[PDB]
Amino acid sequence: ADLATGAKVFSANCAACHAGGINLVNAEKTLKKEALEKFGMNSIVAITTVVTNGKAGMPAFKGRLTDDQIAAVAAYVLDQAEKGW
Template identity: 75%
Template sequence: MKKLLSAILLGLAVFAFGFTSPAMAGNAANGAKIFSANCAACHMGGNNVVMANKTLKKDALEKFGMNSAEAIIKQVTNGKGAMPAFGGRLASDQIEDVAAYVLEQAEKGW
């Protein structure tokens, strides 16, 4: 009886966790505030004042392989080229929120 009950519980657990959708990595509403305070000087409206072709618009994010939260998080954390690293200034959850905001805005067309 205990084996049967254990098997049923295991099956329910596998079903419950196996078919749930993953939570969004960041909070876009919070990311908007962080973006405004830290990123907007160079990226207002999804543009890029330093390198005009590397915007935060959907097509440019796709072209340069930055169309995922992971890629944006890496770029914001470590910096690259003219972009400074924000890993020492922002907490990892803040950077995740910025990534969520950037992707959401890119989908909306900024």
């Protein structure tokens, strides 16, 4: 919502591990709505925090993405998950 920036950020930073509906190394490790919901991750604040910091080995993007870029990709992930990738 910046979805335009979000889509670009996703392509350049996230698709390498999450690309095209299902993740390359995963099944429910994709960004499907139901998977996000299990751990309360289906919100702008939750995705912003995990991408910035993130968690449990998932890489932190605080160095290489600005706060605005992270907010943008968070929007993109939520919108795509709602549409169904």
